[PDB]
Symmetry: C2
């Protein structure tokens, strides 16, 4: 087994991995590592697709989606939540502190406040400016820790200028994120509607369950999804879906419909940016 190891999506995954590794390298829990990892990007107003600084919906409201899954089938999720900078941590509170696994809208905010989270104005001057001008994708992280336990976290401000109330894949278990401690974990990149449609990360993990490596599973999910896009009469150039994945042995994999995505991997070899295979050549 190769452990610990953490993967996360996009260039900022490299920086998120560093924070995750501060936990993983000291023998801490995957759950804590992935929370710490993605909060880094939630916190950063120059990362405009996650948390603080996220581009608003078309009504100028910054609404955030996140979910988290630990090594023993515990889950939490918030969607379309406003004024709280660290939705992954509220999702973690939904998981640990309530008998529910998903809260949305005003109810998610009220819960957050009741747990001692603080309202903050998430719309930056920069985002407000660009929104008004307009009027005229996420971070996912999965890790295997020194105990051989998996966990993962996904957080986003969702599609810029979405309809108010729009929810993407990031807070939906089996779409944006899925973890089964006996199999593996996967988290998605791409058009949220399309990852929901195909239940993408549950598919990747079930393909690993069925005996595929993380790499084979990501590629086979994407190839199945490519055929569905065609069945739907759509142009593959208009659709992005991709996955990164980890199994219980610390093997990893990534594959997308289209070139141009990258993801960060940190293990005993250190932290680096790698690029997946892709279908649309």
């Amino acid at each position: 087994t190769n452990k610990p190891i953490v993967l996360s999506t996009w260039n900022f995954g490299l920086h998120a991995n560093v924070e995750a590794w501060k936990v993983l390298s000291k023998g801490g829990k995957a759950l804590d590592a992935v929370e710490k990892g993605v909060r880094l990007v939630e916190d950063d107003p120059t990362e405009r697709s996650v948390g603080y600084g996220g581009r608003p919906d078309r009504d100028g409201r910054v609404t955030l989606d996140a979910c988290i899954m630990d090594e023993n089938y515990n889950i939490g999720s918030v969607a379309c939540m406003e004024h709280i900078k660290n939705p992954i941590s509220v999702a973690r509170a939904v998981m640990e502190k309530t008998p529910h696994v998903m809260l949305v809208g005003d109810g998610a905010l009220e819960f957050a406040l009741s747990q001692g989270f603080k309202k903050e104005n998430l719309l930056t001057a920069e985002s407000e400016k660009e929104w008004k001008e307009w009027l005229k994708d996420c971070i996912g992280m999965i890790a295997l820790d020194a105990q051989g336990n998996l966990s993962g976290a996904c957080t986003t401000s969702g599609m810029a200028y979405k309809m108010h109330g729009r929810v993407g894949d990031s807070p939906i278990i089996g779409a944006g994120l899925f973890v089964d401690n006996e199999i593996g974990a996967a988290t998605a990149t791409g058009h949220g509607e399309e990852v929901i449609r195909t239940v993408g990360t549950h598919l990747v993990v079930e393909l690993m369950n069925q005996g595929r490596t993380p790499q084979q599973a990501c590629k086979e999910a994407v190839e199945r999804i490519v055929k569905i896009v065609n069945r739907r009469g759509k142009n593959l150039k208009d659709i992005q879906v991709g996955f990164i994945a980890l199994n219980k042995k610390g093997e990893y994999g990534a594959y997308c419909i289209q070139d141009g995505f990258n993801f960060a991997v940190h293990d005993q070899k250190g932290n680096r940016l790698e690029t997946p295979g892709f279908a649309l050549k």
Copy 2:
């Protein structure tokens, strides 16, 4: 060549009230109509019924006395629509169908879902009946949803799921019913499945996507429902929980019109209407 036997049209729905919801779906299916129209019409009957207290009008409120409704819908070509935690609209399944057909999104929640519904001509209505208000105030001091899946005369699958959610849930709580892959999943080249019960547990295990993938890899609909239930049973134990506290059922249909179901605990039936008639059937259960 096509199958020697396909049982179509056919519609299945969860719980005893599925029997009369099936009659309404069959008005569409028996005339060669689309599975998508059939399953919408079928579940709207229950949404419309104030005496059905876990779906639509008359649904028991969250703990603050808001009736907030969840539904999703899926047709024969991976088109999907979903609303969740939506207030004041009696037929969330039809707003879900509008999300699917009329927007570039697949899920709206909360205020945004209501504003969209109003923009589409749905009418704001008071969904809290005197009876539900009475019970709620007192509280202060089975049939948890309807899922319906159908195979029409063309050989196409579609499904719908709609609920008012756990009674006296936290404000904003969403269960499995509006989540594609949890409460409902339909793939026209394999089969369809819809779920009922403790929504948290169906979300946890991505239940209907799992049932349909098990059919994909060769299980019959009943085999796939049963194996999914038994996975939930294993997970409940891994989590150190007591199975007695949990109910989940699945019903499932494949491309040939074969069907099946299975649940954790007894007392769950489903209704199936095909050309031979409308039947209330009782599946096996895990907790014996």
